[PDB]
Structures are given as structure tokens and as C-alpha cells.
Design a protein around this ligand. Structure first.
Ligand SMILES: O=c1ccn([C@@H]2O[C@H](COP(=O)(O)OP(=O)(O)OP(=O)(O)O)[C@@H](O)[C@H]2O)c(=O)[nH]1
Lengths: 133, 239, 157, 357
RNA sequence: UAUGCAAAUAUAAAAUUAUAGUAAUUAUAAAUUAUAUUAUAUUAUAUUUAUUCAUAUAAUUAAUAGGAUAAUAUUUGUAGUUUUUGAUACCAUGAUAAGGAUUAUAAAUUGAAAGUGUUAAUAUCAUAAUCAAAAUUUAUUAUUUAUAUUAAAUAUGUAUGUGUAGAUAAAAUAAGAA
């Protein structure tokens, strides 16, 4: 009777240091010896978890434009996603790309330290978006 | 699956479970440094004797004193069991540690007519030598208790000076496993909730942890643990 | 996750952090969104340099850029729900279930004042307190006095 | 009351209780505190000094007349924090064609030091012939009595370290205290470059000699870069020098040894591409560095991991153990009595109870 | 509704019940507990105003990490998967509200402690949470009435019908009431 949110995980350091470092005990946190963070998630699980972070306008949301499911069940009534080609007919296509999201350094100060308009706040310190890398 | 060594039950086999983070007095978690590689009397065991430790004198100082002596530095050779001692350290005077407690109580002439030399005047420097520097440290304790101004211990003593192997006060660094239960003297009761809490003493303590710690050499360390991992009796996430 | 070893007593307390993050996003986007909105719908000529087509084309392009800005904080402040940071209880600003100075709900305020957790002074329930401006004109008068102290006091350069 | 804690600074009830200062009582400072004056910590920064030169300086200082005369030639040689990208053979040819003309030993030495620095920056190994042509005959040969300038010797050491040359020992032994005695004037950057070069070259005795000389001359181990120390300590394999490294590793600070372990781990793992030349596998040194860092660092408490396999005493847990040996205590008592001599020595004892397993 | 047929509490007694065998004593007393002002006398009560009352949505909560004018750390770029299990879609102890009937003029306030969703020990599939543009059926809510009527976040198309049944709400405090 064992249940688990994630059925598979991967380590951080590869097979060049851990085989020698295992002989030295590590003082893990006493009240939670086993830890399982986002940097320890598998590729698919991490992707599907990161898609659900944004409230809307994100891949996790069923109707945000970036979904991948063929159909979505809504109130016991199936519905079919209108493809991008069919949307284009009556929705004019305006798309600049990654250049639109980014803003110049001179405007970074006015934008309060942000050069990206992405709805996830990007921080330049190497500690907040701290995956394995 | 669940195990008696993985669940959180407070009491195992009738005694307080030592595997609970909440079953230990908070002062145990405080950071501390390993001291098993330090001097025997500098280790944490002699907490009540730490305030009485003597100062140092090294091989360079001892050789310099041997080459160029000075009139007011009494080099006391506090070695017992005269059958063991063979050579004579230069400028040395024999005051055994088993007699120092009464010897320091004698007057000037009272000490001179019994030991063949006068009192160190309680102001001149005294430097104590013994095998392994154990009896010398124990004697320096007594000298400091008698309030001598300058008492120095030569760690290593005649053993390291002459390159012999004499071990006075034969003591083993390792300890026999604690066959009995957890002593009552280590049981801590909370001052507010009145809960019974443990302490790093008796069956489990810092000396046991240090002596159980891994060896510095990798090829020797691999000999202890079996193949395929050093610790496999425990789950993957608890190692 | 999924209520496995939860540390906080209430799950909804994380919505306070989410609201703080949305406020920070508003801090980022409040200038760019306002500038784009101002430029897009200004019918009068900007200046001598840009007039006619050189202005209308620029307005269309800046509106296209604003639309392409993914994640821009469009939502106004008054439509963002206020949730207490102590017990994660929702209150709407403008009613009595939310206080502006402490940013906590009516229930949290009552609990904190009934216990000792917030140094406040008691006044009559059916009066205007002790403030001279409140006695003089009331909520609107004190609001205008705050405006006067902040901005209208200064002879701007 | 409750799971949420109460902050005593904001809560007036705590601040006005009998364990703090009531508002009716006079508000005044009590027991003024001086922490920064009784014991002031030195400034240790987590981030490295951003404005640091981060290189070996040559202390270029010649007569102004000679400097301005050689200015057309010296434009190609590196200046202060400015490195021209002229080919090294061009400056080598200029030196070998113009050095006899200028009559000044100090100026020639400074010019050759700059040539060595430039060719070291370009990693051009062909310039040792210049040393053999000019300096070897009089500065270090069959008991040479000359005193080379500090700038020239430092530049030559930098060049040999950059090119991983095998001729550095003949100069370092002269630079010991019994010879030129230029060791105390070597920068920590020079020491780091020497250690990194020797670690890459895999010299077992060079690392030991350099570490001992650094300790003797009070080189700043903490300011010596961690990567150079890691590379130097990776190459030791012999038992004697390994023991020397083991006993010498205690000289470094706790933070220094921790970051040495961190750099060693990351470099032999993920940071293998950081080095231009991959580091050889030395599991003995890796394990010893990790173990030494663990020893030096403060020890935390992990009771579950420490006592996972802990088992209580037989007598202590007899009531809670269905199948436990109790006659073992009687056997131990009998053995103790026999050792004491109260019981007959080596008396035959038969089993007192059945064996239930 | 006394004419006959009919000894009968005004007491010479031996713990209850029972045919004088059934069970183990039996009865009784006192204190306290919400029903009854009296007609000068610790207060004259008696007037004005009002009543078509409605809203909730698209799921992941369990780490510390410092930068210019500072005597030097690449710590540039800090890298050890996996043995636990409740405030969640029931339940998972306690705690604040509303509710005026007798301590009054006087140098004075006309709002109560008896408890109101969220808060501190019982567990044992629980991902129910706003960041806009959204779905009355639900006791507890003062709306503008007939000269001039929709411009800035998008903001109400419904019900003209003799001030009109039943039922019901509010006020004796800078107001005017005996
Ligand atoms: O402390 C550090 C960190 C990083 N690096 C990086 O190492 C790269 C080259 O890799 P190496 O550092 O292995 O080469 P090297 O021995 O020739 O390096 P130098 O002594 O000449 O510097 C360089 O391009 C630098 O960015 C260091 O050299 N040192």
C-alpha cells in the first residue's frame, strides 16, 4: 500500500563524484531526511509541473493557446480545440517573437530591474531559478 | 514499507527512541568540532580539567635549552617506574608525579633534604617531561594548583626525545560498547512540558560517533564496508 | 505537495505570496503599459517631428507591440482580491471586512485588538474618533488632506 | 496561542508585560552596547574582489630616457593592463636584433622580462632559447654569482608556468633562501600559477616543495585560488608526499577547505570542461579532501541516521523481545568471577537452559 | 339521600414488604427551585414615520547563499534522487456578535459576558481558491416618482394603474411630543 506523487526521479551529480563521496556521511535535515525538489524531478514531470505554474496564458491551462490536448471535457460535454490555422482566418496574426518580450537596458531601470516582459519574473542572480545548473 | 526504525513512535523496546528529532535536548544540535586527533587531555572528556591545562614547549625549545641552559628554568623529569627509564635528560631533576602532591607542600629545606634539590621558588619557570607527556601534564596540574607562575609541559616527552616507545598510563582510545541501558544521569525532563528527553551520553555520545567515523584512507575505508555501497541497511533517501 | 507533510496550517496562505508577486509584476509593467496606452489612443499630433502618417503608423506599431507583450499586467488594483496574511481570509477593500493600514481582515483585526497583538487606542463607536480632519469633514476630507500633504504641498518645478 | 507565532516587537502585550518596559515607565536607553569595538571582525567578502588585477605583475620601471627611446619597440610589448596582440616572433626578433645596441644591463633585463611576459600570454614555448642565449651564461650556471632582477625572474617563472616547461626547478632552487632569496616577494598569483602548472605537469615532489616553501615564507593560502590548489593536490600519488599533504591540509582555513572540496567535486564532475586539460582520476586524494573538509566543518546532528541500527540491551529490552538470550548475562558473570579468581579457574560450566533457536 | 339487613381509626405497642415464608431494610424531614403590582406614592408614554430586496469563478502549499571607491578566496558558474502519512470536497475539543424594562442630573456615555463561519491535541484514498470580463430561487435588504435624462475601465428593458389587502419595521439622545 505505497502511494507516490512521482514514480521516478534522477540525481544531480553524475557517476564521477558520488561513488567516492558516498563514504562520507551527510548530515541531512533531522525532521525530513528524504527530500525531493524540483531540480530532482524527471523531464516530463518537471515540464508538466512547470506548465501548471501560471494561472492562465500558460501551457498548463486547458484554454491558453499553448495547450496540446486534442479535446477537453467541459461539464460532461466534450469540446474540440480550434486549431491555429482555423483561428487565423478571423483572428489577425500579430507576432514579433522573442524580441518583443525583451526590453533594453536603459529601460530596465524604469521597468524596475526587469528586461523581460514574461509573466514569470526573471532574476539574474544564480540562486532563484536554481535548477541543477 | 514502514518499519520500527522508520516510524515516529516515541518508545521502542521500552526505552526512549533515539531516532526522533524531537527526542533530543536542543543543546546537542549545537555545532561542535571533532577533537579525537588532538591531545589526549585537550579532548572534550576533561571538561572539568580544561581550565587547568598547562602551556607548551616544543622540540626546538628543548634542544635550545639543552645546548644553552639557563640558571632559573627547572627541567623536572616526572617519570615513575625507574625500571623503565634508561637515559638522563640534561639539566633534569627527578620529582615523580606520584609524590608531587606532598612534595609541593614541603618547605624549602623540608624539600631539599628529601629530594636533593631546593624548591623552584614558585616564580622560576618549570618544564615537565614524562613519557607521552601524560604524567607531565598531570603533574603540571598539581603545580598550577600550587600556584606556580610558569609551568610548561613537554608533549611527547622523553619518549619522542629519545625515539623510544614507553606508554605510561596505558589507555585505549576506543571504548567497549555500552552493554547496559541508557543511564538515568542522562535523562532530561523538560522544564515546561515535563517531557523526558535524551542526551548524547552513555550508549550514544560524541566519543562513540568519532570512533565510528570513517577512516581517512580510501583503500582502508573500502575494507570496512561491503561491496555495492557503504550503507545499504537503510533506505535510499536515508543514508 | 498534495497535503503530504504540509508545514503551514493553512494552504491558502500561499495566495498571499501569489498576490505579492502579482503586485511586483504590476510594478514592472505599470510604466510600459501606461506609455503604450497613452501613445496608442492620442488623436492629436504628438509634435512637429511626427504628424499624420508618421504618427498613425507609429501608433499602430506600438499597439501591436503592446499586444505582443506576453504577460503584461493588465488587471487594475481594485479588482485584485485582498487576502489576509495571518489566516488567509478574503476581504474586499471599501467594505468593513478589510482595514487599510494593517492589511488584515475584520476578523483578524478583531482578534488582534481583543488580544494583545496590535497597539491601538479605543474611541467611541458612534463618533468621529479624535482626528481633527475627521471631525471637520470626515473620510473625504481626510482623504483630500492626505492628497494635499503628499502632492499639493509642493510647488513643483 | 496557535500554530502561528507571536512577534514580541509588534505585539504590545509582550512589550508592556512585566518582562519588558511598560510605557508609563520612563523610556530611556539601558546598558549601552559596543559590539563593533570590543572585537571587530576582519572584512571577508563572499564575492571575490571585482577590481583585482587577477594576474602577475612585473614591476616594470626603467629610466625615462630608455623608456621613451624604446617606446616604438615597447608599444608591442604589454603595458599596464593593456595587451597588444602582436605576434610573439616579431618582438623576439626585435629583441634579438636590438639588445646588443642598447648598453644597459637593467634595461636589457626589463626588456627580456617583457618579452617573456608577452610570449607567456601568447603561450609561445619557443622563447626559452632567449634565456639560454642571454641569461643562462651568467645568472645560473656552474655556480653563477650574478643577482638577477626580481622582474626578470618573476617573468621567467610566469613564462615557464604558462608553457609547463620542465626547467622551472633549476631557477626555483636558486630562488630559495640560500640563493637569490626571491621567494618572499612572489605574489599569490605567482604561487597559484606555479601550483596549477605543477599539478598539470604531474610532478610529485614539485607540489610538496612549493607547499612547504609557501608555508615557510608565509604565503597566503586563503588568497591562493582554490582551483590551483586542487590541481596541485590531485597529482600526488606517492605515499610519503601523500602523508605530507594529509598533515599539511590543516593549515588552510575551514572555509578554504570547504571550498577546496566543492571545487574538486565540481571540477572532477560537471566542471570537467572548465579546464582546458581534463584532470586525472585520483580517488584517494578526492576522498581524503572530502573527509578532511568533513572533519574541519562543524558536525550537525542526524539522530535517525546515526542510530538507525541501534538495538537496546538484552536486559533492557527483555520484556519487549519475545526471543532474547538471558543466560548470556549469567555466562558473563561466571567469566568475570573466574577472571577475578573467586570461582575456580577454568571450571566447566554446563548449559543452564535450553537453546530456543 | 339512616325503617330493616352493617362491630368498628379516636389508638396497652416488638425495623420494611409479604396469608405471620417470596425482596434486604422501609419511610419521613429540612433548605433551595420563575408566575400572580394592587388603586397619592420613586416619573406624563403616546406620537410621528416607514414596508415589491437580488448576484461568487478555469487545482500542485514543505532551503541558505553577501559585488565599485574595503590589503587580493573564480566561493566567474557554491550541483550527494528516491521510508513517509491530517485543517483537504465530511468529521478532525476551547475563543470575541447580535439581542434596550428600573443605581436619574450631577462637575457624567442610551449598548450586555453566557456567544457569533474561519483560531491551539480525536485523523487515515481527498490537488477543489480570485491575478479580471463569469451561472438569482436564495429568510434577515431604506431606490432616484412626471419642466430640461447614456462622454471615458462595461454598468441594468422594466412593474403607470384612487399613497390602495393581509402581515410587519423604526424613533422620546440638537432637538421641539407631557
Ligand atoms: O579560477 C579560474 C576560473 C576559470 N578559469 C578559466 O580557465 C580557462 C582555461 O582553462 P585552464 O584554467 O585549465 O587553462 P590554463 O591553465 O591555461 O589557464 P591560465 O592559468 O592561463 O588562466 C580560462 O579561459 C578561464 O576562464 C581559470 O583559468 N581560472
Amino acid at each position: 500500500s505505497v502511494s507516490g506523487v512521482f514514480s521516478k526521479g534522477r540525481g544531480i551529480g553524475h557517476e564521477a563524484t558520488t561513488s567516492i563521496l558516498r563514504y562520507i556521511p551527510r548530515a541531512r535535515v533531522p525532521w525530513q531526511p528524504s527530500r525531493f525538489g524540483r531540480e530532482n524531478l524527471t523531464a516530463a514531470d518537471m515540464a508538466r509541473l512547470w506548465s501548471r505554474g501560471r494561472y492562465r496564458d500558460g501551457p498548463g491551462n486547458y484554454n491558453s493557446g499553448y495547450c496540446t490536448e486534442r479535446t477537453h471535457v467541459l461539464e460532461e460535454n466534450t469540446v474540440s480545440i480550434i486549431p491555429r490555422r482555423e483561428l487565423e482566418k478571423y483572428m489577425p496574426d500579430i507576432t514579433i517573437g522573442p524580441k518583443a518580450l525583451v526590453t533594453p537596458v536603459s529601460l530596465m531601470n524604469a521597468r524596475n530591474g526587469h528586461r523581460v516582459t514574461h509573466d514569470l519574473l526573471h532574476s539574474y542572480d544564480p540562486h532563484i531559478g536554481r535548477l541543477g545548473k | 514499507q514502514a518499519d520500527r526504525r522508520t516510524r515516529h513512535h516515541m518508545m521502542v523496546d521500552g526505552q526512549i527512541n533515539p531516532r526522533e528529532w524531537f527526542n533530543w535536548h536542543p543543546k546537542e544540535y549545537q555545532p561542535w568540532y571533532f577533537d579525537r586527533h588532538k591531545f589526549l587531555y585537550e579532548q572534550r572528556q576533561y571538561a572539568q580539567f580544561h581550565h587547568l591545562l598547562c602551556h607548551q614547549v616544543y622540540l626546538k625549545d628543548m634542544l635550545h635549552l639543552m645546548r644553552y641552559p639557563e640558571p632559573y628554568t627547572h627541567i623536572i623529569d616526572c617519570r615513575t617506574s625507574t625500571q623503565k627509564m634508561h637515559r638522563w635528560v640534561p639539566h633534569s631533576l627527578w620529582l615523580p608525579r606520584d609524590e608531587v602532591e606532598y612534595a609541593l607542600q614541603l618547605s624549602a629545606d623540608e624539600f631539599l633534604d628529601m629530594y636533593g634539590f631546593r624548591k623552584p621558588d614558585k616564580s622560576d619557570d618549570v618544564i615537565l617531561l614524562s613519557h607521552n607527556g601524560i604524567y607531565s601534564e598531570q603533574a603540571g596540574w598539581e603545580w598550577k594548583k600550587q600556584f606556580f607562575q610558569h609551568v610548561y609541559n613537554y608533549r611527547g616527552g622523553t619518549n619522542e626525545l629519545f625515539g623510544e616507545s614507553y606508554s605510561d598510563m596505558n589507555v585505549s582510545d576506543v571504548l567497549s560498547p555500552w552493554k547496559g541501558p541508557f543511564p538515568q544521569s542522562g535523562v532530561f525532563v523538560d522544564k515546561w512540558s515535563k517531557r523526558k528527553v535524551l542526551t548524547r551520553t552513555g550508549p550514544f555520545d560524541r566519543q562513540y560517533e568519532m570512533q565510528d567515523f570513517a577512516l581517512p584512507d580510501l583503500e582502508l575505508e573500502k575494507a570496512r564496508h561491503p561491496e555495492e555501497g557503504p550503507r545499504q541497511n537503510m533506505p535510499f533517501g536515508l543514508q | 505537495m498534495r497535503h503530504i507533510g504540509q508545514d503551514v496550517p493553512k494552504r491558502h496562505t500561499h495566495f498571499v505570496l501569489e498576490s505579492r508577486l502579482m503586485y511586483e509584476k504590476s510594478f514592472r509593467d505599470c510604466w510600459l503599459h501606461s506609455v503604450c496606452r497613452a501613445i496608442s489612443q492620442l488623436d492629436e499630433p504628438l509634435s512637429k517631428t511626427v504628424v499624420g502618417t508618421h504618427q498613425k503608423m507609429l501608433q499602430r506599431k506600438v499597439t501591436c507591440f503592446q499586444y505582443n507583450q506576453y504577460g503584461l499586467f493588465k488587471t487594475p488594483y481594485y479588482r485584485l482580491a485582498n487576502v489576509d496574511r495571518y489566516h488567509a481570509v478574503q476581504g474586499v477593500a471599501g467594505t468593513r471586512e478589510w482595514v487599510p493600514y494593517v492589511n488584515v481582515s475584520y476578523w483578524t483585526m478583531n482578534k488582534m485588538v481583543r488580544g494583545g497583538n496590535l497597539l491601538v487606542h479605543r474611541v467611541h463607536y458612534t463618533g468621529w474618533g479624535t482626528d481633527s480632519h475627521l471631525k471637520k469633514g470626515g473620510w473625504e476630507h481626510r482623504w483630500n488632506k492626505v492628497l494635499q500633504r503628499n502632492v499639493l504641498q509642493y510647488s513643483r518645478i | 496561542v496557535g500554530y502561528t507565532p507571536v512577534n514580541p516587537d509588534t505585539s504590545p502585550m509582550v512589550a508592556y508585560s512585566q518582562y519588558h518596559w511598560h510605557y508609563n515607565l520612563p523610556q530611556g536607553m539601558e546598558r549601552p552596547h559596543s559590539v563593533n569595538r570590543t572585537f571587530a571582525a576582519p572584512f571577508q567578502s563572499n564575492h571575490s574582489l571585482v577590481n583585482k588585477y587577477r594576474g602577475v605583475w612585473i614591476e616594470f620601471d626603467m629610466h625615462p630616457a630608455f623608456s621613451v627611446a624604446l617606446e616604438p619597440q615597447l608599444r608591442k610589448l604589454p603595458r599596464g593592463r593593456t595587451l597588444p596582440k602582436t605576434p610573439a616572433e616579431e618582438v623576439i626578433a626585435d629583441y634579438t636584433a636590438l639588445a646588443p645596441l642598447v648598453d644597459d644591463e637593467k634595461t636589457r633585463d626589463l626588456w627580456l622580462a617583457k618579452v617573456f611576459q608577452h610570449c607567456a600570454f601568447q603561450r609561445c614555448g619557443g622563447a626559452m632559447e632567449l634565456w639560454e642565449r642571454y641569461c643562462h651564461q651568467r645568472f645560473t650556471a656552474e655556480g653563477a654569482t650574478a643577482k638577477p632582477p626580481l622582474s626578470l625572474v618573476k617573468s621567467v617563472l610566469f613564462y615557464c608556468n604558462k608553457t609547463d616547461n620542465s626547467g622551472w626547478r633549476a631557477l626555483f632552487d636558486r630562488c630559495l633562501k640560500d640563493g637569490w632569496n626571491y621567494t618572499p616577494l612572489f605574489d599569490t598569483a605567482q604561487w597559484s600559477f606555479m601550483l596549477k602548472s605543477i599539478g598539470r605537469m604531474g610532478d610529485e615532489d614539485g607540489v610538496r616543495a612549493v607547499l612547504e616553501e609557501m608555508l615557510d615564507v608565509q604565503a597566503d593560502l586563503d588568497r591562493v585560488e582554490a582551483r590551483s590548489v586542487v590541481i596541485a593536490l590531485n597529482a600526488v600519488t606517492n605515499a610519503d608526499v601523500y602523508e605530507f599533504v594529509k598533515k599539511y591540509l590543516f593549515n588552510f582555513g575551514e572555509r578554504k577547505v570547504k571550498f577546496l572540496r566543492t571545487t574538486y567535486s565540481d571540477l572532477r564532475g560537471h566542471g570537467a570542461g572548465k579546464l582546458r586539460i581534463p584532470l586525472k582520476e585520483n580517488d584517494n586524494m578526492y576522498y581524503h579532501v572530502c573527509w578532511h573538509s568533513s572533519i574541519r566543518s562543524p558536525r550537525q546532528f542526524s539522530p535517525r541516521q546515526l542510530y538507525f541500527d541501534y538495538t537496546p540491551s538484552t536486559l533492557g529490552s527483555s520484556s519487549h523481545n519475545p526471543n532474547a538470550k538471558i543466560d548470556d548475562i549469567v555466562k558473563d558473570k561466571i567469566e568475570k568471577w573466574k577472571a577475578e579468581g573467586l570461582l575456580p579457574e577454568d571450571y566447566v560450566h554446563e548449559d543452564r537452559v535450553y537453546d530456543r533457536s
